[PDB]
Amino acid sequence: HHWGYGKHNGPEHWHKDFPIAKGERQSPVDIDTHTAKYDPSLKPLSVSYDQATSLRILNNGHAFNVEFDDSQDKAVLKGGPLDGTYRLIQFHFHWGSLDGQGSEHTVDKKKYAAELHLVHWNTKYGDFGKAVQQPDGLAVLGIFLKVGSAKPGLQKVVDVLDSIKTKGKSADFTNFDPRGLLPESLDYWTYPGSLTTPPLLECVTWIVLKEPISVSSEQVLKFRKLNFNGEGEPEELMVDNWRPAQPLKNRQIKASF
Ligand SMILES: COC(=O)CCN(c1ccc(S(N)(=O)=O)cc1)c1nc(C)cs1
Numbered sequence: 218h219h220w221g222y223g224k225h226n227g228p229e230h231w232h233k234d235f236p237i238a239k240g241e242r243q244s245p246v247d248i249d250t251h252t253a254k255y256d257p258s259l260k261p262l263s264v265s266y267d268q269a270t271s272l273r274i275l276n277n278g279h280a281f282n283v284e285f286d287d288s289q290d291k292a293v294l295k296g297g298p299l300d301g302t303y304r305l306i307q308f309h310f311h312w313g314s315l316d317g318q319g320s321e322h323t324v325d326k327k328k329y330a331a332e333l334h335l336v337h338w339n340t341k342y343g344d345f346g347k348a349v350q351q352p353d354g355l356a357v358l359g360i361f362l363k364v365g366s367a368k369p370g371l372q373k374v375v376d377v378l379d380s381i382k383t384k385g386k387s388a389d390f391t392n393f394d395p396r397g398l399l400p401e402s403l404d405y406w407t408y409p410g411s412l413t414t415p416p417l418l419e420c421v422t423w424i425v426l427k428e429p430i431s432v433s434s435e436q437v438l439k440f441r442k443l444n445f446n447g448e449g450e451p452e453e454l455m456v457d458n459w460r461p462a463q464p465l466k467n468r469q470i471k472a473s474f
C-alpha cells in the first residue's frame with residue numbers, strides 16, 4: 218500500500234507515512250498575486266542550460282523524469298533568490314485528467330493544465346541525496362503549461378512517451394535541450410517550501426515563473442496516455458498526479474517584478 222494519487226493512496230493519506238506533510242513549509246501553495254511583495258533586492262534569474270546533458274527518460278510510476286548528467290558543472294541555476302550554484306538533475310511534470318486542472322501551484326486560485334518542475338541541487342552539498350537534507354538544498358523552477366499552440370521544444374519528449382508507457386520503463390534520451398521548455402520572460406515568484414511528493418522534505422527554494430508556456434491539446438493528451446501501473450497490470454491512466462495547494466503558514470511569497 219504505497220503512496221500515489223488515487224483515492225486510497227493520494228495526497229490526503231500521505232501524512233500517515235510522512236508526518237511532515239502537515240509541516241510548516243509544505244508545497245505547493247496558492248500564489249495570491251496581490252499579497253506577494255515585490256522585492257527589489259531579488260536578482261534576475263540566471264539559467265545556464267547551454268551545456269546540459271540529458272541521458273534518459275524514465276516512467277517512475279508517478280510521472281516521467283528526464284534525467285541529466287549532473288557530474289560536472291553544466292546546466293546550472295543561480296541568481297534569482299539563490300545564494301551559490303544549483304545544478305540541474307532532472308525535470309518532470311504534473312498534469313490533469315482535464316485541461317482545467319493539473320498544476321500544483323495555483324495563481325489567485327487559477328489551476329493551469331500542467332506544471333513543469335526543473336529540479337536543481339545546491340552544489341555546496343556535493344550531490345542530491347545530501348542536498349535534500351538541508352533547508353537550502355534544492356531549487357525547483359516551476360513553469361505553468363496552458364493548452365493552446367504547440368511547444369515545438371516539447372515534441373521530442375512527447376514522441377518518446379509511447380516507449381515508456383508503463384512504470385519502470387526507461388528510454389535513452391540524449392541531446393534534449395531544456396531551453397526549448399522556457400517561456401520568454403524569467404519574471405518569477407519565490408518562497409521557501411518542500412518537495413511536493415513523498416518524502417515531502419522541506420528543502421526547496423521554489424521559483425515559479427509568471428509566464429506560462431503553451432502546449433497543444435495533442436501534446437497533453439499524450440501525457441495522459443501514460444500509465445501509473447507496470448506492464449501486465451490493469452490500466453490506470455497517469456492523470457491528476459498533482460498535490461493540491463497547502464497552507465502558507467508563516468511564509469511570504471516575493472515577486473521579482
Ligand atoms: C529523498 O528525496 C527524494 O526522494 C526527492 C525525490 N525527487 C523529487 C520529487 C519531487 C520533486 S518536486 N515535485 O517537488 O519538484 C522534486 C524531487 C527527485 N529525486 C531525484 C533523484 C531527483 S528529483
Ligand SMILES: [Zn+2]
Pocket residue numbers: 309310311334413
Ligand atoms: Zn514536481
